[PDB]
């Protein structure tokens, strides 16, 4: 409700090292959604939106809505990877809740 | 002056026959300082822990037993 | 031997007059060198001078861009020890305008007896008048 992330699908041709580097050059972020009773889904987000969401403390405890097209998932942030020297986010895990 | 500068001649240890190859009786399979591999069916062990074949057949490697030892055997 | 060379006895040199007011030095010198060497004629031959005569008037109105008026340096060396002399574009253009054109075109012509012969066909005059009315030069806008 308070936090909505707009995402696109990440198909198999957009996975791997080269594809992820191309995405990050395009200034997007790959992410994975897993959790009980369903099959994991791979998505992509916007760096500015992710940074803005992480700027607030309450984001790490609330349930957020990730919307890709018509469907919508209610998740919580589970893990996060950062660049060691620049601190820019590089990947994200979301657990279904 | 230095106090180092010594070494010993090479000893040429290692696997001589790999899995899936055919052997005749007497062929040496593994040269090893200790028992890194153990003798299975149709394989004998020498006094310096060398593994050799005692029958004609095909070499096979596996992991077996309660201690997880590596075994080599010959299938006829 | 079907490809023929031009014969010097049949070469015909025409006379042209060019006004240098407001032109850029190098972009004028390239065209002058082309027409002095004769690259614009279909009888062009590397070992024969087939070019035209070029008169240049209003030589002190030539221009350079950027800060080159203060910064572009002209050097020469008398062969005595320590004898390096230096000047710049503003002083040189107010003093001897012909030297600027001579240096610029000399740099772009070939370095040999034929090049010495080809540079002799360029006449540079400071003012708006030239003494070659007897040759009836034509106006060339380059």
């Amino acid at each position: 409700a308070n936090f909505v992330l707009n995402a696109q699908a990440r198909a198999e041709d957009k996975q791997g090292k080269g594809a992820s580097r191309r995405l990050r050059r395009e200034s997007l972020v790959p992410a994975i959604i897993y959790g009980g009773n369903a099959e994991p889904v791979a998505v992509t987000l916007e760096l500015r939106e992710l940074v803005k969401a992480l700027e607030s403390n309450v984001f790490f405890e609330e349930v957020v809505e990730i919307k890709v097209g018509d469907k919508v998932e209610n998740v919580k942030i589970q893990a996060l990877q950062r660049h060691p020297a620049k601190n820019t986010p590089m990947h994200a895990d979301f657990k279904r809740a | 002056s230095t106090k180092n500068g010594r070494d010993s001649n090479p000893k040429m240890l290692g696997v001589k026959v790999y899995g899936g190859q055919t052997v005749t009786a007497g062929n040496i399979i593994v040269r090893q300082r200790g028992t890194e591999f153990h003798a299975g069916a149709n394989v004998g062990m020498g006094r310096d822990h060398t593994l050799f074949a005692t029958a004609d057949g095909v070499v096979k490697f596996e992991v077996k037993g309660q201690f997880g030892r590596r075994y080599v055997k010959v299938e006829t | 031997m079907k490809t023929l060379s031009a014969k010097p006895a049949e070469v015909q040199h025409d006379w042209f007059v060019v006004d240098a007011t407001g032109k850029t030095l190098g972009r004028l010198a390239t065209e002058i060198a082309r027409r002095l060497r004769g690259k614009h004629k279909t009888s062009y031959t590397p070992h024969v001078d087939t070019g035209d005569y070029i008169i240049v008037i209003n030589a002190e109105q030539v221009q350079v861009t950027g800060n080159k008026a203060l910064d572009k340096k002209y050097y020469r060396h008398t062969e005595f020890p320590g004898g390096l002399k230096e000047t710049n574009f503003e002083k040189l253009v107010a003093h001897k305008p012909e030297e600027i054109f001579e240096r610029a075109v000399k740099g772009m012509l070939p370095k040999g007896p034929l090049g010495y012969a080809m540079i002799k066909k360029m006449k540079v005059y400071a003012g708006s008048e030239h003494p070659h009315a007897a040759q009836q030069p034509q106006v060339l806008d380059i």
Partner: protein, 137 residues
């Protein structure tokens, strides 16, 4: 001057310094820290000088955590000695620095004071640094 109390071997190979600092790039003791953004070497004298500057600036009002330790010995030839004749003698100790390595952390001090102290310390170091603070993840 920091130095190992004991070592297994006196002299070590030169090696190569490649890669990033995936370990030791997260604030774990204090609230604010300084981390290197460029790779290089850090000597014991440099560590001591930076620590002294930071402590003097912060007036011993908080705790300072040092997260780099020099454990690699470096040798040098005696001087006016020709090539050969064995490896040289140990002269000083260094710590290898990869981008992302956190050098110092401060606990219990105001942020402006900590930034002033870190700015003073950075002028003593042979590589570029940056300032980071604690985050949830």
């Amino acid at each position: 001057m920091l130095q190992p109390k004991r070592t297994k071997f006196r002299k070590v190979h030169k090696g190569r310094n490649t890669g990033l600092a995936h370990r030791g790039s997260t604030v774990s003791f204090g609230s604010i820290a300084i981390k290197a953004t460029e790779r290089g070497r850090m000597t014991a004298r440099q560590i001591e000088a930076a620590r002294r500057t930071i402590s003097r600036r912060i007036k011993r009002g908080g705790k300072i955590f040092i997260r780099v330790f020099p454990d690699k010995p470096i040798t040098e030839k005696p001087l006016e000695v020709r090539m050969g004749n064995g490896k040289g003698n140990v002269e000083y100790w260094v710590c290898e620095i990869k981008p992302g390595k956190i050098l110092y952390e401060i606990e219990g001090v105001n942020e402006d004071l900590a930034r002033e102290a870190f700015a003073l310390a950075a002028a003593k170091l042979p590589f570029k640094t940056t300032i980071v603070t604690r985050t949830v993840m």
